[PDB]
Design an enzyme around this catalytic site. Structure first.
Site, PDB file in Angstrom:
ATOM      1  N   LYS A   1       0.762  -8.690  -4.640  1.00 17.41           N
ATOM      2  CA  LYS A   1      -0.211  -9.770  -4.778  1.00 17.41           C
ATOM      3  C   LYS A   1      -1.542  -9.213  -5.284  1.00 17.41           C
ATOM      4  CE  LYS A   1      -0.071 -12.972  -1.527  1.00 17.41           C
ATOM      5  NZ  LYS A   1       0.163 -13.726  -0.291  1.00 17.41           N
ATOM      6  N   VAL A   2      -2.030  -9.789  -6.375  1.00 16.81           N
ATOM      7  CA  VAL A   2      -3.277  -9.350  -6.975  1.00 16.81           C
ATOM      8  C   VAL A   2      -4.244 -10.523  -7.097  1.00 16.81           C
ATOM      9  CG1 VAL A   2      -4.328  -8.282  -9.001  1.00 16.81           C
ATOM     10  CG2 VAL A   2      -2.011  -7.632  -8.308  1.00 16.81           C
TER      11      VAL A   2
END
Lengths: 220, 220, 220, 220, 220, 220, 220, 220, 220
Positions: free
Chosen positions: B85-86
């Site tokens: 997750k960014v």
């Protein structure tokens, strides 16, 4: 579109099977109890009432997933190809996943919400049955729930089918069919109302009278 | 449709994995912190709580693209097939491109706008996660953002999926699913509410009562 | 518009009364129970925290109409002008009619359906409180229920007011207000979220930054 | 409808006051800073540029309610009938209530949400100013926020007025006016674009040409 | 809004009159027949079951206008202020006009179409009663008919009221009320369903549980 | 709402006047011609068929404004308070203004367009009669024309009334009434269909059957 | 989806090409003029700045079709695969047809109307660029024009693409993308606003805060 | 999309053929008569003005089917591949069927209604031409007729094309194109207005101005 | 699309078959009875009037399923490929199922409701014929019924076709075609009105006038 009768009235099923293009018969604990005959007796009679063809649905009674699976096995021992109805509860969902692994077709029943219904399909249920009239009776909108559920299955569980149930009036059935439901089960009174109309009888009687008056015959 | 639980509660995941048809578990910096266990400990435990299967999501903490890529490598060293997750920021977009080049699957998170979400997908993200409730809480419309985002991905990044997150009520989840979201992650309280209904319990109780009144027992 | 806080937290009420333009405070059995203090203690404190002004709401506990009327008398003996909340059940409706005859203002609570809500207003209730989030949580649409209820009161019981309650997110409150609700009661967390925004704080920050840049200071 | 210019450009105000039917001028910390002149200098010049009539708006800088009230007093000492802009934050809401008690007109500014805006009006603000373009820029819908806010004031705070602000294009201003906003403040570039059109100039030129061709002159 | 019960069950009326805010009771030939008691027996008992107040409705049986007028006189001799129901047929219309001249209030009943209903109002009927469920049962839309009828009366016979009748489910009643019907008459089963909800009972139970968990009792 | 019959059938008018609440009778050149009786014979007879009351309408035949005015005078000499129908043509408009100056009420007829109809009202016509079915028959939408015309009169000629005419089916009449038409004239066949329904007859027979079964008679 | 930057700022393009997934850069006479660098200097620099890969657009200056074709040849001599922008005027359309015959890709620019845009596509243009903000600024609706244009191309010139241009706010860009535009070119300020949000930055900060509070470290 | 010019102005056709991507030219009896040149003279000239390519349309003048077929043969003897326009009357329909058998392409013209248009397509017409402006001029809705006709052909005569004709303003043409018309024919004045805009000319002038200001020339 | 004439008028069919693109002729008992001519005479004559081609429809008269099947056999003996019309009643449904098994094509007629119509298709009917005008005449909406029926067949019985019947005005036919009906049968008067228009005749006249004014004749 699969058309079912929601009843345990064997005599009525035999009579109506000649009129309606039935796919089978659905039952639930209350319908069975109302008929007084036990499952091992009625299910075979219903199957027969339909020339030994069609699909039957019967509901589990156990409260635990393990118990529901055992109930499913018992039902299948009565009718080999019967579809097992499982209430969509926490344990019901667990049972549906187990039955999916065992290859026993299920129907997620006692559905009062669209998301709840979708979950049963994601768990493996082939059919999802929202209780249309009960949702309506309890201050909601049975039709909106059916509409939402159908949309959810269409985009998230394409092979699952909505089996609309619980009806007090033909209008509810019509709206479920307009919503796209793949299957529907009708109680006997609603089914009869759906094929009996004063306007139709008036038209037909008029045709019969004009014809007899012109050719003095009741046939072609 | 991929159904995930948004939690770091290992015991709860094991228990609920038996009930819900889970695709995996998602986590974020706050959820991990709330659990008190470090990543190299909780992730393996969560993976185990799911029977050694399913997909896991974990978030990077670095602020620069280079740092985020390094965080991604560290996460992948803990769980080989984990999805990284960014946060969709300027540096986050840069990191997402780099990770795509490296073949590491990513999810664009902390999405508060549809265009922002689309950009992360165009950069290479496999999933885009709008924070539905946070958008709602801050005077916007989480559902409209999800609806707009889904339409944008559908016509501009077909292979990208919306992973709806941040929920306070089942209604928000329902609306995201009706909007067509391919995936969704639910906090434990909302997930539980989605399978527990007074109306459903009342129906099951009624079925049991009718069954007993006709057969002297509540068992099939 | 009447803005209320749904709480029994005296300290919080005193603090927030200085910020929000409050009309008073609402309570229910669970809110009271969670506060641990008995009615004869908490109600007076809440009134005080309100600067001795404002309207208070408290709920009856009895199950029969006669018992509810007695509960109403007891509540009024604690707070002379308190509005008595009565669950809209068969007995509740009977109690509401009796209280209307006695001149004691009531609020029809525990409303999960629009028709149910209208009936309480027709029976004499000054306020009707649908449980928005609970309706949402149970597969319905709290907003549609509120919308339908408001329409029903507007054309069938003009002097009755909708007092929207049960919230998990500001969006639900916003939608109820957009639906025209004359009153609303918010739990403390939702109320706080309604006045705290990252975007607003950022705007204040930028203004100070530009000010300091031109005048070498952040004050007038 | 009150038409304002959002600027601290005295010369421009004097020139445009002859063209537009202005109700006054609005300012904010950034606009004042851009002009470089301090409040005690620009406000009087703006009042004069308006022919000594019209209404002026200036914003407080303090962060606490007490400080904001003091800022309000200082602003009123510069321009006796000035309307004090207060950011709608927790402390801002408290300040607005205090200023109402003191009879000093206020405007709730830095509004990014409809509910937030309504709260400022309920607290006593005569005007509520949503930042249309900033809401648009940050992934929301400035027009929907304005529409929702106007609806909320119309039914919950009838005497409060929406003063739409923050514009990058005439279309945003048009939509706010179509939404029913009672007042609006335009930056100089948008205001100029609103009265300059190639199509209009072409029509005027064509009229002159036809007149010339018929009467040998362009004068009446 | 005038709420009526559609029944000849005196005991039920007496019991429900203390729960619902009833305007009276409506009857029709089938309802009277099912009760077996003659008109001059049941009507006075129903009036009594309602504390000697409220409005009553009874239907004529004659087929000619003259006969219907005579029936009306007979009904009025039993209950002086009774409202006479007249089927909206050609002769019924003629009777309604005659009764309007005689000052005897009428209700146009057996309405299956909006125009038909309007005609009865134009002829003098104070109430117009569409048979909602029958229209639904026969392939039409009872709600659309009610909606159309209400609009017709609103713009063409402002003082006439729609008295919606014939219900199988609460949803039909809700929709008629949402359509703006000024009056409605409910059969006993639908009326009972409208005030009994599993969700409501569950909420009350939860309140009692929390109350005892904190105070050791479920009272006060 | 003024209900008229579009006919020159004196016997039918006499018979139907006791059934329908008629405001009068309308005629046109073709209807009069179909009856074969000359104007100064049929008009008085139609007036008598209505008991010497009601409003009558007759159409001019001349093609010039002067001729139409003379026709109007002749018609008024036959029936003193008759309303004169004038085709809405260029000369017709001129005639309508002249007749308004003379105080002779007119109806703008042969209206196939909304603007055309509005012009006749602006010229002085008290009624405007669009030919609904003819518009439908010729590829347009009679209902949309009526809807547009009604809206135009409502906002531009408030005292003028739409008198919808030309019908082949009750549905057209219903839609005109739903559109808000203040008056309407029906041909005999459509009027009869509007009060005769197989469903209604079926219901009335059932009431008689149930009554007979309970009381041994068909009378009250 | 082709995302372009509308600029001649080489340094900015280099920097942003790393962040956004750019398809190339678009320029126009004013943009080139603003950069002060001649075409033979900037175009090559832009090609390398965008990544040595991508598409460039440059506009002709001539007023006659022949002159525009010559301009196109000159542009192609600077950048071999450049797309030539041609204002959609009478001569522009003629030029587009000629360039189509020569196999030089074109973009119909300076589009202020949907039909005008369609004509350029029918003439051979691969892209059609409506000036969204200019249409908005001049009293129209840039979004409606884009919506109409996209529909026209979709059904009448399927292979042509809308390249939305001229933006003052991210909302305009969002609406164009929601309308289905295949491509879009953003000025630098709008592009930056599209990836910078106070709410997003706040979410990242809280995550860091919770993280360090539980693990006593900032790193993952 | 086939773009045609509705004219008999040879010189104009030659000039505009270089600008617009023309499919050909359409003519009708009035257009031809206005040109004063007979068919055997103008048709070949128009074909030549089109570079000897494209499609031409000419209308029959006979009133009987046989006569129309003979007229078709005469027109084809002038232009071998001409499309014959036949008014959609009863005899026209008969002629269209005969021409279909004879392999001569036809266009059903003088269409004032959608069903009428559909009939010509079902009879064999390749094109159907509704007279948009005449329908508008006569109180109808040319656009609605075009929309309905297109829908009818789309689902009932897939290979038939709508060739929208009769225009007074560009807007009508735009709306027909938005309705999906496969072909359209424009009178010369509307065509010119469709490519000439004050806003566009202004944009071009501004570009030239900026270019000159930066490069001292207005050329590349 | 299949266009039929609803008649037994042989001479009219022969004449109109040359004008309309007919698929055949439909008949019903009233059409035939009125003719007084037996089916073994009328059917062959109609078949001949159709050039020995086309499809014919005739209705059974029997009241029992067995009798209807026998009627079907008799009809097929007169016209080998005739489609048998069966009233959609309980026995009719049974007959349709039997005829489906025998391979005799059927049409479900006397349809007054959508669900009723769907049932006939599910039973095997190739066509379903709702009586549009009769539904309209009896207070319903023939068009809504057709719309609903078409939707039901489209999603639940794809190969079944709606054959719209019973018309009093062209508008009803147009609306049925716009609803998507695959087939339609028109009475002679409506069919004639559909191809005869004053506006069309006027256009033809004007063309002739212009032509003669320019060429001295109305031909060539």
């Amino acid at each position: 579109m699969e058309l079912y009768l929601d009843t345990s009235d064997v005599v009525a099923v035999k009579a109506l099977s000649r009129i309606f293009p039935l796919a089978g018969v659905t039952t639930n604990p209350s319908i069975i109890a109302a008929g007084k005959k036990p499952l091992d007796v009625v299910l075979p009679q219903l199957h027969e009432a339909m020339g030994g063809q069609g699909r039957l649905f019967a509901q589990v009674m156990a409260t635990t997933a393990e118990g529901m699976v055992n109930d499913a096995l018992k039902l299948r021992s009565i009718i080999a190809d019967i579809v097992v109805k499982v209430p969509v509860t926490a344990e019901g969902l667990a049972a549906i996943k187990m039955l999916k692994a065992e290859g026993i077709p299920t129907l997620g029943t006692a559905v009062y919400g669209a998301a709840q219904g979708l979950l049963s399909a994601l768990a493996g249920a082939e059919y999802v049955a929202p209780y249309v009239n009960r949702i309506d009776a309890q201050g909601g909108s049975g039709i909106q729930t059916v509409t939402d559920l159908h949309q959810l299955l269409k985009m998230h569980a394409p092979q699952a089918k909505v089996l609309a149930a619980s009806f007090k009036t033909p209008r509810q059935a019509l709206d479920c069919l307009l919503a796209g439901c793949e299957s529907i089960t009708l109680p006997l009174d609603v089914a009869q109302q759906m094929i009996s109309y004063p306007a139709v009888d008036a038209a037909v009687a008029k045709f019969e009278q004009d014809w007899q008056g012109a050719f003095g015959r009741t046939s072609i």
